[PDB]
Structures are given as C-alpha cells and as structure tokens.
Nucleic acid binder design. Structure first.
Lengths: 210, 75
RNA sequence: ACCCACUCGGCACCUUACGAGAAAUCAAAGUCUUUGGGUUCUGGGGGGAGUAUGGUCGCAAGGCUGAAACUUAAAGGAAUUGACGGAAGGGCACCACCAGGAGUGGAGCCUGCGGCUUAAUUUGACCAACACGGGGAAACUCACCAGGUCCAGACACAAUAAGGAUUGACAGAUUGAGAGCUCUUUCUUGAUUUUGUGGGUGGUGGUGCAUGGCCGUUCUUAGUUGGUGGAGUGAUUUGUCUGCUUAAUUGCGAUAACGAACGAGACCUUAACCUACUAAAUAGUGGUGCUAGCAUUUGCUGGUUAUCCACUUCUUAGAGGGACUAUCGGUUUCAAGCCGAUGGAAGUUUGAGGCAAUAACAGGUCUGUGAUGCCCUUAGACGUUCUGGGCCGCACGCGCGCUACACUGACGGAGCCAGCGAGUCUAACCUUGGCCGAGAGGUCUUGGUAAUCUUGUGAAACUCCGUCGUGCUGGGGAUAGAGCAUUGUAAUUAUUGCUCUUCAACGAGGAAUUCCUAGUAAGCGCAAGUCAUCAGCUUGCGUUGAUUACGUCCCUGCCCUUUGUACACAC
C-alpha cells in the first residue's frame, strides 16, 4: 500500500502485483503524485472517485530515471488509471439521506408513496413504539425531497409534520456511456456545467494494444 | 528483489492444549472399607517404567504412557 | 638625395612601472582618501526595455526623447585552478597504429548477460558487466516457489498454576511423510513451561547513494607535496623548466630559485652463471669394488651406505660471488645518455613479477564476515529448519570459450622425453602390484602424513611405418537411440564416464574487432581451485615454438605546453 488519493485518504488504493521489478523504489514518489490526480477529478465528468482500486499488475520502466521521471510519469499514468477504471464499466454512486420523518399514523402512506418518486426508496418502515408518530429512513438520490409538506397533508389530517436528515452514499450501475441511460444523462447536466466534451470518452483511446 | 506475502490456502493450525485432568489421580486407586488400596491401571513390565506408571487403557491394547510400549490384556 | 646632431608638430612604438588600477593593463587610464586646473555629456543591480505611450523630425524605413506595472538576488569585469575543444604544438602506449602473426565475428557445441516463459526460472555487475560473485547449483548450497515442521519468545514484569503452568505420547485418521502438527479414545513428566506487556534475539531482509574494510579503475601512466625564497592585494604560481635524454618529474642542462620528501627507482622474490665453499640412502655418479646375467676381447644391466668405499659436476639449498652497461670506436654542446663491436652465463629496468604515491569514483561488495547504523520483520515467522521443484526452462540478440571445417590431415601400430602439485589415521585420501573386466569399472594387497609410494606422473603434440586419396571424405562429432559402471539416500529435467548405432552445418569466414616484438604469440599436454561425482573454466607448470619491427603519433586513448571558454554537477 502506497497512498490513498485524493488527499492521501480517499478510498483509492495503489495495489501492486509487481513482484519482479527493481525500480519501484524511486518511482513510488511520482507514481503517487499523479494517482491522486485521476481520483480528485474523473474521466467521465470530473469529480471524486470512491471505492476505486488500482491493481498494478506490472510496470515497465527505463534504466535511468530521467525519461522515467516526473515529466514522463504523471502523464503516462494519467492514461493508465483512466484505462482500468474505464475497462471495469465505470458507474455512478449517489449520496442518500438519514431522513426520519415525524408523521401521523398514515402519513407513511403519504411518505412511503412520495419516497419512491425519483428512483429513491425506503430502508425500513420503522416507527416509534410509544406514539403513533412513525419515523422512516429512506434512500433519496439527493434528488429530491423538496418538502412534500403538502402531499402528506392531503391524506391524513391535522398532524403531518415532515423533518429529514442526511447520510452516506449509495451506488447503482446505470452504464453512463450512452446519453440514454438515466444516470448516463444526469451526467450531461454536470457536463455542460463544466464546459467540456458532451460525449464520454471510451477506454479505447485510454488503453493501448500489443 | 521484492518479496511477497505467504499465501494461506488452509486455515490456521491450532496448537493442542493439554487435557488438564482435575484430580484424576483419585481415579487410579481404589480403597475398601478398611482402606486397603489397589491399583486400577496395570504397571509396565519393563524395568524402567515405574511401580505406578499406570499403562493407559485403550480399545484393544494397553499403552504405557512413559515407556511407549504395547501390552495386550489377554497377552 | 642621403649621413650626423638638434628643434617644433603628428601617427605611433619599446622598457620600467617610481604612480595608478579590481586586474587585464596604462607613459596616460599618472600628478585621485596627501581626494578641488577649466568645462560639457552620461551611469546608479539585472530584466521588463530602448518597450508602451506622448511628442517631434522623415516620403517611408525609422531616428531623437522616453517610462512604468510586474519580476529577480544576482547580472557583470579581470585574473586563478580544473574540466572540455569537431584548437595548435609535443610525448607516450601492440589495453593505438606501420610490418606481420594468431584469431573472434561465419558451423556446431559449452557457458554468461539480456529477452520470452514460468511457481520460482533468486540474484548483483552493464573500456572499468557478460567461464564474473571463486557461481563446474540433484539434496544442501539457496537467497525463490508449493508445502510440512522448532522456538533457537534470552531478561524483567503481570497473569495462569502442585485441587497441577505444562511437554511428550504408542495405535487409527489427517498428513508428501514412521511431524501426537492436530484430532480420535487418556497415560508420562513436573514449575523446566503457557498468555500478555516491555526488551531483545535471529534474518543470503533493504539500504554500497549511510558506511568500515577490501577490491578495481583513473593508473602501470609518472605523478604528488610541503619548508624557505621570488611575483601577485588575492586565489594561485615559480620551484615541478626551453632544449636534449629516459620506461620514468630518469637525468644532463637551462635557472627566481634553493634544498627536500613520497611514487618511479632503490627494495625483495623468482630464473638462468659458478667443475668454487658446505654436505648428503629422501639425489646421483665412479669403482674388469661386492653378486649375478647378457653378448663375448670388456660393453650393456639387476641388490648395491641396508652388500662396501669416494665424491658433489649433474639434484637439492645455505652463504656468497657474478654485470655495474664492462672494454674499444662513433654521436652530441663537453654532457646525461644513445648506437655498434669485443669479451661475457647473463648487455631489453638482464628476464618475470610482488609491494607500489596524493587525490578521488556516489565504480562493486550489507548476498564473505558474530564488520556495521537506520529501517522491515520476529510465532499463521522474512528467523531456524525437512520433502519436492527452480537456478539448466527457449521464437531471439550479443559476449567468453571448446570442437572443428583437413593431406604440414585423419586412422592404426610403434619410438617414446617434463615441471609445477597433491595425497589418509583429528580416516577412508593418494594408491603401486596381482586378479576379474571390451570398456566403464570392481577386486586382494603394497607404499606413502610424504625429494623416498603413486612418480622417471612413460602426458600430447612430435618421430617412423602402413591405410585413406579430394569424396563435406575415413574430417567433423551436433542432436538422438539402446546397454554397462562408479559417487551420492537419490542421476528423472540425460551427473559423469564407457559400449555400439547417426554423421547435421561447417570448403577458413562480410563490416567490425581482440591480443601480441623472443623462449615471445600460437600448437600441445599435465597439475591444482572447484569436488561425494561433475573442467569445455581458471590459476600455474611445463613440451614444440614463429613471422615481423627495433619505429610513429595517422587511427584510438592518456599525459604535457600554449590557447579558447559564458562550463565547475565540469560537454
């Protein structure tokens, strides 16, 4: 284990299968220099990687470290990480919330119905034993429970009262290569908000042959 | 030369902990109403075994414990 | 016209610097820290930038005038040392050439490096790596891989614990396995031990770019230094050199240098000379000496200090002696030397080595070291071990070697001469002789702890005679097949040798390149390190034994003088 880019803490590992290579000693300084770059900003639409692993099966180097130095290490691995991460069908992971919606008896009927509106869902349909005030945790792809503070009030009566909180991530693979998949199109909004190529580059341009 | 981790294709092997008998010595001698004691396990016939070596019982023979010989009950 | 001697003015020039200057340098750049003759212009770190803009002049090109923002800690001058030059001159070197020799590269094979491959194909090294790590690895080696084992957890503390901390356990199973490793049923021993915490300990683990030491290279070249003195403000320089000469900073000689020192040399060892000294059954020789044989005018041999005596010329090894360029002629400026001849064992530093200067190189080595810091690990161990595999795998390139591509050969028979070694009783070493055996080898004994026994190491080229007869042939032995032996427990991924079967490319080699000037290269063999067996390797020893030249700096490098430089990490 070498580093945990970005920042030396992100869930990205420099795994080496290199078991018969000599010059790993003087390149571990600059291998890790650009490993954190490709995980700070990404290939598809340019943000932080998460649970992305780099398994260096092998490395080929020079004799001396001159053309094996920083001028020829950062760029060359900026195309190597972009290869494997694209060869394993890069996907999307979306943060969710730790909501606990205070509610009456059947506001869950409102809540449980308005939770699964935009690909979100429910963790559990739990409740408070002491009162008919039910509490629900849910998956919400941070998109988006704008306060439905009217919708649950249209079913139950005079106690509806939504309050939510926030939690960790959540992943679902939608194959973002084509501008047809649902998560392959949400990236488009983030794309033109960056101002770069509309199309996602495939792995062919980032991966070579024999 | 760069080394590598030694792979474990089998789970760990646990060193055997001795069966700590609790006053089993009280179960090798039997006394009567007059206190007359008599050995319950046989003794090793080899000279360098002991008068109380108490050959371990088994299914179909008698193992010493110290001299590591083989005895048969019916010989 | 010129010559001589003046004088004014001009371009200058040569020496010295008294003087000045940072110095180069200068006769003005002097009369300036002892600072003031008159007077105009310009400069105030480098870039930005002579830029923007404004202005003016010009047909324009552009000129003149002319910033700032921002940016930087140096830019720059002159010399010194070094380095380098596709700069000059001068020396040196068969790790360069001339004249040549032998090759390598081309065929095959051994072996090393890379690369491909795998479980590993462990590894370091890239003129100064690549038959190197003494590295010719079955196990070990061994550092890797698939596995199985021990704690080799010192010491201190806490915990457990004689109502037992504990270790061992025959049989089955597991298990590569006759590891009670651990399970299956329960015996042996007894605070030895078990768990944790600190501390170690061990590691062919990493770090040679943290190092010591060692070694190699620069550099086998002749170079390095300080004392005093001289020049400079100084770094530095002279000394330490123009020339000649030497293998040489070896000397002659010239000198702002003198006297010195280390390296070279001197030193020592080896080799050849010594009819001279000393000797000797572990060396030999002479004795119609001892005895016997041979052939018979008498020569050759066997036991001859143990069957005798005399000796050291051969052998050995102590002390020495011998050449120091000795004598004669030539050369040079007498000279250092050089050249030739004579004599001489020896006339090339007599031959050949050993040791071999300051300074370094990030040369290599932590994988030689119980040399060694730091870091890594330390019980499911990277420590220690046992089994098996790997280091040797193979489309390929290169290196070092061996075999050869033939008649100055091969084959067969015969003649048949060394040295340098080594060798076991603190044990299976070296083995003679006889026997078995085509061989390989086995065998009984002998001798040797060693000038004695192997051993006169009877070795091979070579010599003679015969076969082959220009046919990639009888050269060649590559790959492969079968069997017999030794060593090792173990020969399979052939150990090696031996027997027979096969005779592949190879008709002498393109660029290129290696090494070499006399007992020389090269042909030839032997010994030894390796080692239980394995020598195509290597150190030495010898056997046969050339050609060519006694030089040059053209090529390649190195060194010196001058020179140039904006480099100093030094092209």
């Amino acid at each position: 284990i070498w580093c945990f880019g970005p920042d030396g803490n992100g869930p990205n590992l420099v795994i080496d299968q290199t078991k018969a290579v000599q010059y790993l000693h003087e390149i571990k300084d600059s291998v890790v220099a650009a490993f954190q770059w490709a995980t700070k900003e990404g290939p598809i639409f340019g943000e932080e990687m998460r649970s992305v692993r780099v398994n260096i099966l092998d490395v080929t180097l020079h004799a001396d470290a001159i053309h094996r130095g920083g001028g020829q290490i950062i760029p060359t691995m900026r195309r190597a990480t972009y290869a494997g991460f694209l060869l394993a069908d890069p996907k999307i992971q979306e943060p969710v919330f730790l909501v606990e919606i205070q509610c009456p008896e059947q506001a869950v009927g409102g809540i449980y119905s308005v939770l699964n509106k935009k690909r979100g869902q429910v963790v559990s349909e739990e409740q408070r034993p002491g009162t008919p005030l039910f509490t629900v945790k849910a998956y919400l792809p941070v998109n988006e429970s704008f306060g439905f503070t009217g919708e649950l009030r249209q079913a139950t009566g005079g106690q509806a009262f939504p309050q939510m909180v926030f939690d960790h991530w959540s992943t679902l693979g939608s194959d973002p290569l084509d501008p047809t998949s649902k998560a392959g199109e949400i990236v488009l909004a983030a794309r033109k908000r960056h101002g770069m190529k509309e199309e996602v580059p495939g792995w062919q341009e980032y991966y070579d042959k024999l | 030369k760069k080394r590598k981790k030694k792979v474990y294709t089998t789970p760990k092997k646990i060193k055997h902990k001795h069966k700590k008998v609790k006053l089993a010595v009280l179960s090798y001698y039997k006394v009567d109403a007059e206190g007359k004691v008599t050995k319950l396990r046989r003794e090793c016939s080899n000279p360098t075994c002991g008068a109380g070596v108490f050959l371990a019982n088994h299914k179909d023979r008698l193992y010493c414990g110290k001299c590591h010989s083989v005895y048969k009950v019916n010989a």
